[PDB]
C-alpha cells in the first residue's frame, strides 16, 4: 500500500520513515528526492544501499542526501570505522561553525531561492516572540 502510495504522483505526504535494515533494500522509487541518514552504519554497504534507493534507472530529479553526525561523539568514531571499511570497495573497483544556518542552507541549496525561503522561515522563527 505504502509503496503504491509513494508512487502516486499526487502523494499528500512528502516524506516517510524507513528501517535501514528493512527499507534500505525494499524500495523502487524513481520519484525519490532527498535522503536523510540518522542511524549511521557499522557496515557501509547498508548505507550505500539505502542511499542509492533514491536514484535508480528512471530517476528524474537531482538527489540530495544528508548524514547527521553529532559533534565530538561516538558517531564520529563509528563513522570513521565505516570509512575504513570502504577500502575493500576500492580493492574491488580497481580489480574490475557546523551549525551556521547560511552555510547549511548552501549545502542544501538547489537554488538560492531555497535560501530565501529559509530566510523567511528564520524571520518567522524570530517573529515567534
Amino acid at each position: 500500500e505504502m509503496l503504491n502510495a509513494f508512487n502516486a504522483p499526487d502523494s499528500d505526504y512528502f516524506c516517510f520513515l524507513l528501517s535501514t535494515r528493512a527499507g534500505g533494500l525494499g524500495l523502487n522509487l524513481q520519484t525519490a528526492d532527498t535522503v536523510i541518514i540518522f542511524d549511521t552504519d557499522w557496515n557501509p554497504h547498508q548505507d550505500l544501499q539505502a542511499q542509492d534507493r533514491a536514484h535508480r534507472i528512471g530517476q528524474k530529479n537531482e538527489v540530495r542526501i544528508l548524514r547527521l553526525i553529532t559533534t565530538d561523539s561516538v558517531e564520529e568514531v563509528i563513522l570513521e570505522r565505516a570509512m575504513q571499511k570502504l577500502d575493500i570497495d576500492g580493492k574491488v573497483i580497481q580489480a574490475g561553525a557546523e551549525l551556521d544556518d547560511d552555510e547549511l542552507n548552501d549545502t542544501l541549496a538547489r537554488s538560492a531561492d531555497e535560501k530565501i525561503l529559509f530566510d523567511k522561515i528564520d524571520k518567522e522563527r524570530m517573529n515567534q516572540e
Binding site: 533494500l25 554497504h45 550505500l48 548524514r67 553526525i69 553529532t70 575493500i88 580489480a95 574490475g96 557546523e98
Partner: protein, 115 residues
Amino acid sequence: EGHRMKNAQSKLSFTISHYYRTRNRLILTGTPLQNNLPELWALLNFVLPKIFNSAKTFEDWFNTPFLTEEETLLIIRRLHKVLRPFLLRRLKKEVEKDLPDKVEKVIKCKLSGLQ
C-alpha cells in the same frame, strides 16, 4: 539480494544446500561482501562449490588488503581474472551517465544542553 547470504554458516545458507536438486543457480547483489574477505569467499563458494581450499584462502591467495603495484594491481588483476567469468559488474556511470549529480553531502551538529 544475495548480499544477505554473507556467511555460509547461516541457517539460510545451510537449508539452501538441503534444497538438493537445483541444477543452475544465480546470485543478484548490489555489492560485494564485508571487507574481511572470507565472506566474499563464502559467496563464491556458495555460488560455485569449487572455489575453495580454506575459508580464508583469500587472505593469502589474494593478499592485497591482507609492495605497491605488485601486491595491489597484479594480485587484484588476477583476482579479477579468476572472477572475470563469475562476477558481472558495471557502474551506473558506465551505464548511463544520466544521474543528475554526484548526489552527496554530510553534515555535523552540536548537542543540546540536555544531550
